[PDB]
Amino acid sequence: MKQYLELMQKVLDEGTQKNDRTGTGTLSIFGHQMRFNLQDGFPLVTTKRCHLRSIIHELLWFLQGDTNIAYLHENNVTIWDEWADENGDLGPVYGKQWRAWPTPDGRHIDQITTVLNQLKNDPDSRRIIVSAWNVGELDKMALAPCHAFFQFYVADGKLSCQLYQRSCDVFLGLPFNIASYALLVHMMAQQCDLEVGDFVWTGGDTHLYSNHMDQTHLQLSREPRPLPKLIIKRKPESIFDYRFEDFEIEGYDPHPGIKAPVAI
Amino acid sequence: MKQYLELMQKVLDEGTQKNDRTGTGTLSIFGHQMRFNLQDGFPLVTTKRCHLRSIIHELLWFLQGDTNIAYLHENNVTIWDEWADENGDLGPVYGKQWRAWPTPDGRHIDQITTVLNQLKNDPDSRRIIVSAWNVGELDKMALAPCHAFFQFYVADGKLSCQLYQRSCDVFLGLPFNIASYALLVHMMAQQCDLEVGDFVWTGGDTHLYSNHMDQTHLQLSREPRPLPKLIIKRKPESIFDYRFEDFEIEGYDPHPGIKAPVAI
Numbered sequence A, B: 001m002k003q004y005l006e007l008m009q010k011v012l013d014e015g016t017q018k019n020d021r022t023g024t025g026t027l028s029i030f031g032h033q034m035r036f037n038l039q040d041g042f043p044l045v046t047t048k049r050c051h052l053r054s055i056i057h058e059l060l061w062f063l064q065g066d067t068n069i070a071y072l073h074e075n076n077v078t079i080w081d082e083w084a085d086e087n088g089d090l091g092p093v094y095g096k097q098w099r100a101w102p103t104p105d106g107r108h109i110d111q112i113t114t115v116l117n118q119l120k121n122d123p124d125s126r127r128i129i130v131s132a133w134n135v136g137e138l139d140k141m142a143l144a145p146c147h148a149f150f151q152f153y154v155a156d157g158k159l160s161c162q163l164y165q166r167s168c169d170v171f172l173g174l175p176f177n178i179a180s181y182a183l184l185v186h187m188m189a190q191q192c193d194l195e196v197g198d199f200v201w202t203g204g205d206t207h208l209y210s211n212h213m214d215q216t217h218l219q220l221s222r223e224p225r226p227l228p229k230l231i232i233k234r235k236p237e238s239i240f241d242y243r244f245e246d247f248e249i250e251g252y253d254p255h256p257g258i259k260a261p262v263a264i
């Protein structure tokens, strides 16, 4: 993806050496913004094969407010195994904050529903936000939310969304983070009878791990292919009624996948 | 300011018509990022005279976790009068969330102190964040926080900060929002024995009110003057011990002030 490869080069050319949690060094930049016109095509990286399968299950898992990996396991999705405790619990992460943000007075706020209500009744609102950054529950989470905060925006019948990502592994995580939110935008837009607009990605500490240099150079030598198209087979009655089989991506012809190891 | 005037032109050239809360129309863009190297000078708009006096008092007021306008009044600062109730209370706004974010279990989190601790003990952290977006208390606030979320970053002994502003009145509010956080960066940096780095401003719904066109065109015709320098007369023992008289801006030679009316 043109915008993506440009970020990779930027991290290489301008990133400063910075170490992560008792481990691998990284090349790091702070503050970056990218824009994807969703009307131009689904922003799924083509310079390396990316599998949407786990992304879709993860998103549907987030929407159900589920915080135990059982659902992911019923579908053989193991991306959260690394963090789940013996019982399969991850703590009050994403799904829990999105659907049941606990208040000091005993309530549980459903931010997804609130946002649906706003887009349908007050589209011009500058307060259509979903936050997963719950300060009071951070100590209980398996890990602090990376995509911590996102805001919606409506203009000319088009729904845009801006995500603020505090930390970002450009090589391994970013291709997935973009596809995940771009999917959510299509789902929201469908439910609110709006066209898709832009997906604006904003990152904090954007980096490349030192042991991923060869993979980065390899990917950078590749030429981006046309973006595929996302197809939603049917329109569910609510944002909580989507099923894995409802989505299909058409015209995705990527370059070979590239593995990237992580230190432990 | 070069980056500022460029944003104004952008809103004019590319902004779409969008109305605000039962009132004035605006020219609006969604998603914008600006960077200010604080080493180049204090980012205080020179194309129109801006008064720092109220900005400083407001910041010191935020730091004390104060949420009643009494302190502002002792100093004849009336920027919050519009929202204060009969008693002078604004609800659990900025100051309250920064210094005493209430948890469901009865605790009150001091995010300013937590952030100081991190910059001093874990500078490489990608989780040095302060959020004022407390979902559970939004209904009690005089207004939902505009500068809702900011993150710190340390690299090569330089402290950078990125602010996410959900809504932004480019003409009236932005010059002030930038100076406010740029001051905070200098204060934090001083307390942690670090040099100042960049101030990255990220905005959501960035706009210009329709009844401010003449003022915008007037300002756009002006040429930016050199940036002033911020001087901190002394180093307090803590971030909570700063006083109005501790700051002085040197070399500020702006163009005449420009008034901008608001509809009611």
Ligand SMILES: O=c1ccn([C@H]2C[C@H](O)[C@@H](COP(=O)(O)O)O2)c(=O)[nH]1
Pocket: A020, A021, A143, A144, A146, A147, A167, A168, A169, A170, A172, A173, A174, A177, B125, B126, B127
């Ligand atoms: O959605 C996600 C989750 C994690 N990461 C990456 C960011 C960092 O490389 C590491 C998390 O480290 P900390 O930010 O907590 O330090 O995993 C992503 O890129 N995207």
Ligand SMILES: O=c1ccn([C@H]2C[C@H](O)[C@@H](COP(=O)(O)O)O2)c(=O)[nH]1
Pocket: A125, A126, A127, B020, B021, B143, B144, B146, B147, B167, B168, B169, B170, B172, B173, B174, B177
């Ligand atoms: O720090 C601030 C606070 C407010 N505003 C502006 C943004 C909007 O123009 C209006 C607030 O409206 P809502 O975002 O709630 O709709 O005041 C700013 O520019 N900066």
